[PDB]
Amino acid sequence: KNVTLTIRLLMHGKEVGSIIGKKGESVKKMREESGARINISEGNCPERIITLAGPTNAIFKAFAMIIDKLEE
Amino acid sequence: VTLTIRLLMHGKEVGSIIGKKGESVKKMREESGARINISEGNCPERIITLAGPTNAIFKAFAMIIDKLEED
DNA sequence: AACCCTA
DNA sequence: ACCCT
Known about the structure:
CATH topology of chain A: Ribosomal Protein S8, Chain: A, domain 1
Distance between the termini of chain A: 34 Å
Keywords: protein-dna complex, DNA binding protein-DNA complex
Largest sheet of chain A: 3 strands, antiparallel
PDB class: dna binding protein/dna
Number of helices of chain A: 3
Structural class of chain A: alpha+beta
Protein name (chain B): Poly(rC)-binding protein 2
Subcellular location (chain B): Nucleus; Cytoplasm
Domain KH (chain B): 2-64
Oligomer: homodimer
Radius of gyration of chain A: 12 Å
Number of strands of chain A: 3
Strand content of chain A: 25-35%
């Protein structure tokens, strides 16, 4: 199949700070490049939820960008 | 460098990822090269932890996506 | 350490 | 489909 998906990641606050970036410049790149709908749960909480939604090519791009950021 | 990623998955999807007798997750652990843990019990949302080099985590994640897209 | 977002 | 650190 080629159905749209919704993938949710449970992330530590520190990691989320890196994904968002100063002024949200990192997640802006992820949204503009991946084609995924990306939602990051509200508040600088110890644990946060990142939602990725779209077809597999978009999910793969966003997930790749997230793990690449975290590897930094 | 090694990362740990946690996916939040509904029980229905976890059943598919595990597979009958754990056959599916077994295959994922063997060829992905990642450590894969699926949370115990029956919470509406389960946690699938993927651990190892980013390449192994990505491979495991790809196998999961493939499973969700089956048939 | 970063706080964004078809609100 | 319920695996197994």
